[PDB]
Write a protein that binds this ligand. Structure first.
Ligand SMILES: Nc1nc2c(ncn2[C@@H]2O[C@H](COP(=O)(O)OP(=O)(O)O)[C@@H](O)[C@H]2O)c(=O)[nH]1
Ligand SMILES: [Mg+2]
Length: 175
């Protein structure tokens, strides 16, 4: 195809589009970048510990980096004109959603990512102990959020179910 490469057209034109993709460790943001098949993934290490991967089909830039971490996860992170915020959650991790909630809530508070559409990918939906979207949507309190227009597509990066269905949404929103 590139069934994906294609959802992003119309968006094609001289100012840079930037889509942020962050989430906790093991949410599957990397499998997401790769299945997306939009060019080859370039890793950079902007400041010690902050491993930032990136991809780019013309003017749509997909910047990705982990959050909620290790010892100090940081400033340096204070966002140009990022119009899309994709936040990915490991559905099988019941323990950590709460952190996934501190991290969704902490980033959305920022000035910079202010008018930035929220697409969340409820990810490991292929495991018998899965947490459905509705459970993910309460456990993250996206129904209180009285500003952003958001969305949560259940997926399975690995085989890629829901990616086209969740990205038709972001696309149109930014459109
Ligand atoms: N069953 C299943 N495992 C997944 C899924 N997505 C990610 N994984 C696996 O769990 C780990 C996820 O790591 P990765 O995709 O690099 O996540 P990242 O640290 O957020 O970049 C890898 O061993 C993946 O193979 C998924 O949708 N289903
Ligand atoms: Mg990774």
């Amino acid at each position: 195809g590139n069934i994906f490469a294609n959802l992003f057209k119309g968006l094609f034109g001289k100012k840079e589009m930037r889509i942020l993709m962050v989430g906790l460790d093991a949410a599957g943001k990397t499998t997401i970048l790769y299945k997306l098949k939009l060019g080859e993934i370039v890793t950079t290490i902007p400041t010690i510990g902050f491993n930032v991967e990136t991809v780019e089909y013309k003017n749509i830039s997909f910047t990705v980096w982990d959050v909620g971490g290790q010892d100090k996860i940081r400033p340096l992170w204070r966002f140009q004109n990022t119009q899309g915020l994709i936040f990915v959650v490991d559905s099988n991790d019941r323990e950590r959603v709460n952190e996934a909630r501190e991290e969704l809530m902490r980033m959305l508070a920022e000035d910079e990512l202010r008018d930035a559409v929220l697409l969340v990918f409820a990810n490991k939906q292929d495991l018998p102990n899965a947490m459905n979207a509705a459970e993910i949507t309460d456990k993250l309190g996206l129904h209180s959020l009285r500003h952003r227009n958001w969305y949560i597509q259940a997926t399975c990066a690995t085989s890629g179910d829901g990616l086209y269905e969740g990205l038709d949404w972001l696309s149109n929103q930014l459109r």
